[PDB]
Assembly symmetry: C5
Homo-oligomer: 311 residues x 5
């Protein structure tokens, strides 16, 4: 239980693989997700080599305590992973094939710019620290990188689970470190957002524009103010299931824009009533008739502009 000694000076290559069994709990606010997978490790330890003719056995099995196992860690985990060693198998040349099943909560930031029409790349960073005896370097065994078909992430579509085969080798606290990037590409299922948030929010907005076909100040006040309160409720509901991004999001922009439409509707409703009382309803009539075209046209154009900027 010391690292296998080098034949020349070559670094020790630990081949890795992650096969996702379960994928759950994608918290958008926390930018965390829970994972359940197999972690497979392989390396050559010549000290464990044997003759398969005389030994009679093709493969020897070991307990973790018995042999040297490289200390593999995840970079972006909340706490150290919960692992259970499934199997350790040594080949006649000394090739070790370690398999463990684990659970871990991962920290991977999300890009909310195109929400709820966004895609994400979740990351799992494998890392190994070199020892004074020899330098450990990570590799990807593409044959042992995969995902169970049943893997389902609620409200998301799992596109691919790949690994960037070239590790990031760098110095950290005067020792070499080999980092691997496992990428899980997922896209958001936006269907639900349409009948639940998008269309209800557009209807409460259009209801506010019926004030352009009424001369009743008392009714218009109620119309524009009541629907504005519904939009505040909408804004809270949306913003409370999202983190505070230092950048502007698509849904962020739209919600904001709709507040300006309410502010300008209130100004129109006020102007129309002022002119009515000022005994000049002809100006009030032409402003109201204009608003009937202006408001939907400007709304539809502002939206085209916004969608264009964000997509």
């Amino acid at each position: 239980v010391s690292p296998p000694p080098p034949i020349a000076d070559e670094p020790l290559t630990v081949n890795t693989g992650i096969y996702l069994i379960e994928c759950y709990s994608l918290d958008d606010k926390a930018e965390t997700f829970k994972v359940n997978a197999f972690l497979s490790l392989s390396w050559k330890d010549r000290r464990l080599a044997f003759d398969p003719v005389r030994s009679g056995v093709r493969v020897k099995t070991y307990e973790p305590e018995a042999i040297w196992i490289p200390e593999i860690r995840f970079v972006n985990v909340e706490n150290a992973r919960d692992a259970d060693v499934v199997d350790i198998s040594v080949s006649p040349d000394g090739t070790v094939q370690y398999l463990e099943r684990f659970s871990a909560r991962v920290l991977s930031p999300l890009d909310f710019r195109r929400y709820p029409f966004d895609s994400q790349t979740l990351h799992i960073y494998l890392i190994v620290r070199s020892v004074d005896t020899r330098n450990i370097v990570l590799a990807v065994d593409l044959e042992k990188v995969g995902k169970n078909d049943d893997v389902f992430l609620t409200g998301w579509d799992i596109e691919s689970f790949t690994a960037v085969v070239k590790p990031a080798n760098f110095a950290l606290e005067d020792r070499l470190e080999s980092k691997l990037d496992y990428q899980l590409r997922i896209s958001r299922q936006y269907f639900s957002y349409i009948p639940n948030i998008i269309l209800p929010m557009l209807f409460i907005l259009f209801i506010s524009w019926t004030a352009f076909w009424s001369t009743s100040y008392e009714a218009n006040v109620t119309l524009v103010v009541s629907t504005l309160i519904a939009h505040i409720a909408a804004n809270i509901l949306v913003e409370t299931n999202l983190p505070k991004t230092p950048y502007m999001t698509y849904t962020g922009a739209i919600i904001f824009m709709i507040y300006l439409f309410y502010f300008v509707a209130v100004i129109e409703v006020t102007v129309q009533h002022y002119l009515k009382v000022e005994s000049q309803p002809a100006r009030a009539a032409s402003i109201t008739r204009a608003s009937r075209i202006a408001f939907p046209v400007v709304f539809l154009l502002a939206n085209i502009i916004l969608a264009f900027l964000f997509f």
Copy 2:
């Protein structure tokens, strides 16, 4: 502590059984449930066999550490199950009888299409990985698959707990794996939904339709807008205790449909008032008289159509 060697080449059959003690916390949003149950395992290990005459006993009790025990895992669990070995017994022929009491949090997706009138099938997937020495295969001891009568899942009816006797055998990372499916059939207790959500939601809708017996634009605006806000409250309350499904649900469809009825009520209320001011209340009267029959008839038909599609 190596797997029992094969007489020929036949795979080792581990007979299983799950007897549910407590069933709780069915989270609809998370699509998870917690289970507390006995796991029983039985397999032949000829090396453990003894003569009852010489040994003076008919059963031999062992500690887990003492003998080979197959590594059984649950597929769809959040974290590895919390288990406590109840007993290990060996018959004279080497028929091992293992029993453990466990608790796990299980991932089992739900079909919200007919919610709150839905039935579900919860799954418990048992899996064993074959070893280099020999191939392990799972079986169901139907005599040891059950549930306590006291088992109660709050707001659900437990219909049955059965096991699909033929395991799913497949290759995973060049080793055989034997998977068993334990199914817990349940159906939702929808009674509470009727006096709490369904009838209150229909009453706030009918209150909106009293606007078809009023000419007061100011009162109508208030009646349709206020009741619309109550429906938004309803929609939030409902949608916050459900996951974001990529498919349309029955409750989803109904809530959505009711938004259209509110939008058309607002349009009618607007049209009637416009015509009043335009000094043609006869047109306004005939449209309002029509709405009194149209709105309930279209509502009741749309509902029959919807129920028909979903059931």
Copy 3:
């Protein structure tokens, strides 16, 4: 570390006792409560017999690992109890006096039918499984069953903590099981419900009935609709701190009934206004005058009927 041998054939009697130290976290929605308590166990194991003359000590102290201890489990726990052995004391005859302090989240269903004026029976089920060597049977040492006086369950009154002395002996997976029932009788402190939910809910209802002393449709609409929205808020607040019962509760029935009173108030307010416009205010006047007596009388009469059904 195997069970003690019988002198004849008699089952091994493990005497039990539970003394409650801290009772807390009664979750009505989950139907769970947390309990911190002493668990005391006593049995005779003649193998541990000693002559204090030789041994010098009159009672021997042991570590759990050192001697055979019966596997006692709780049936209705979420997860296995967190226990810390306080003391294991053996007297010369081999009597083991085991004491441990534990914490556990117990699953005990509640009857919400008379809520908030309900009383409950919480259950703690002790179980022991028989071994092939000899049958273990539970007993209650009434001297060691109790509760600390300081034990306080927030918003509840603790009446009694007793044990059903005769254990439920039954077969389970071809072995005998001895089950004991510890009952904790409690009753809800309903005082807070009166000034916080009951009286505020009756006042918002009576405010709606002031519409029977007004002819202003616009004011009546606002009165009945605004107070109805307050009742929806009330209903949500109440129902979100309760589980979805398949049966009708007292508070459930009352909340429901009050919705009908709002629906009939809206109908009256509509009918009165229609008749006003139809230029027949004498009919409208007599209906409104009737409603002033009808509404409180029917409300008081329906409440008497409801209280009578539920209590």
Copy 4:
């Protein structure tokens, strides 16, 4: 590892001390707080005594496993404390000086009667159970009872941390117990409540009284009903961050009282409008003029009476 033997028959005195390192998470609803502190224990074990001149060392250091340590427990804790032994020091005469750093969630009930102007006494109960060999009794080393100056309990002022030096000695399950009471006196920082809950709640009430300077039934209805809804929101916000007390609180009384003021305002608004329609506005005028003085005077007196009762 047995308790130190008595010279005569005197009970073994374990001197205790708690020094609070960090104090946090005071949950008012749960009536729990999280603590992090040093627990110090000191007793004489003559067996461990050594020659100071002949052993060369003045103080011997031991590992917990090596010597007898009294089993000290907290009464009012959720689960057993998480402890890490800092140091064990044996003096030449056998005085053991044990130190450990621990964290626990303590259950200490609160008196909400004068909330948010209340002061509290948090309790930490230390307990030891006597053994068959000899009786253990607790004592307070006042020199080792304290708190770090940096100790901060958010929204509270820490007044003192003292210990009631005379332990509660009593019998429990036929063995002596020695209980000690550690008291943490704190008083609530009520400043925030004034600009956030108190003044906003009084303004929405005074806004409802502007109805006494209006003859517009439709406006008064809106004024009194709208502000009443704001008070319901207030009441929910307040009551959801407090437990259901079986006694009346000061904030409880005030919130309740304000509901009666709203009920009487609605009655006045109704009476004034009835009289207007009944063509007798002179009676309506005198009732309204009276209400302008009556409402603030009765409000200010009811408050003086309430404050007097509660303080």
Copy 5:
């Protein structure tokens, strides 16, 4: 094992370093944050020294159990840190080089005075307790104090991670304690607050001021009361994601100030209507015309004064 003996009487210097790997979960209400990092420790233990010539190795590796390791603790943690020893390396002169990776929940109070435009200093306090044999003293190895570039704290900007090199040496429970202060300077990303809370809150305020261009008491009541309710919603949303500070905050002051503007708007709306009915609309007109300038001017000045006080 015991601490390394002094050559003269010099205290043992443990050099420390913290290199932040991942920084997450900054709870403003709890004033806690979660940290994942490397802790590096280095001291000289002459007993572990070896001749590299005869040994053949230029360094020696040990298991924690094998050698003396100083008991380093964090002061301001919730619970004791979860640590995993990465590596222990010994140089030929007996210089130990210890590295561990840990995760802990750190308590560090925040200054909410300039929120959401606030910057903070998070603290990590390292402490070691001296022993009777010798005094242990902490030091900072500035070369081993850092942070990964990828370290991201959601909704915050990480400015610097430094250490106050001179430790706080003081007595605690009659033993000397060496305390080190690690400071993490961060500053809040306030962008999101502008389109989500600030601008929506100003628009609902300006909408209430359109009442100064209306004579309709009914429409004014609705305008000022409805927008006031939106401000209450705002106030709750803001205050529920903040702790109850015993001091006034900037956002606290602004929210409060806006309540006074609503109160004075209600008074103006009341005064204007009273004067209208009193048949003196000229006074009402001049008060209303004044309010149109007074309200924005006083609002803009009050804000300049407030910003000036807080910044």
